[PDB]
Design an enzyme around this catalytic site. Structure first.
Site, PDB file in Angstrom:
ATOM      1  N   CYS A  30      41.952  32.689  48.014  1.00  0.00           N
ATOM      2  CA  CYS A  30      41.089  33.789  47.200  1.00  0.00           C
ATOM      3  C   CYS A  30      39.845  34.019  47.197  1.00  0.00           C
ATOM      4  CB  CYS A  30      41.465  33.203  45.770  1.00  0.00           C
ATOM      5  SG  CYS A  30      41.118  34.357  44.539  1.00  0.00           S
ATOM      6  N   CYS A  33      37.127  33.321  44.783  1.00  0.00           N
ATOM      7  CA  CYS A  33      36.984  31.894  44.145  1.00  0.00           C
ATOM      8  C   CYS A  33      35.655  31.407  44.608  1.00  0.00           C
ATOM      9  CB  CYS A  33      37.865  31.155  44.914  1.00  0.00           C
ATOM     10  SG  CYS A  33      39.431  30.859  43.742  1.00  0.00           S
TER      11      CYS A  33
END
Length: 105
Positions: A30, A33
């Protein structure tokens, strides 16, 4: 650094904490993140002794994500006295996280 928490250490690190807990849900795949990781680290140091902060890699601890019905990341969860008090999704600014932290203090 921020300590990692998983399915086996959850109850002890999070649910039995004597202090408010902020948990950062993330995963290697991700992108966004990476953008909040610096804020989480800084806030952890900045609030040492006042709140506990952990990171949970959903790739390795899906059980916890399942228990709290977490279907998206980045997600930041706040716990207090063993109860989930709030959930925030996305790239949260340092300021918004600080309002919440200040609220449970």
């Amino acid at each position: 650094e921020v300590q990692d928490v998983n399915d086996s250490s959850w109850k002890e690190f999070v649910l039995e904490s004597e202090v408010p807990v902020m948990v950062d849900f993330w995963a290697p795949w991700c992108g966004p993140c990476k953008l909040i990781a610096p804020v989480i680290d800084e806030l952890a140091k900045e609030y040492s002794g006042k709140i506990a902060v952990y990171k949970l890699n959903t790739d390795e601890a899906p059980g916890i994500a399942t228990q709290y019905n977490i279907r998206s990341i980045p997600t930041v969860l706040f716990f207090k006295n063993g109860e989930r008090k709030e959930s925030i999704i996305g790239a949260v600014p340092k300021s918004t996280l600080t309002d919440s932290i200040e609220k449970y203090l």
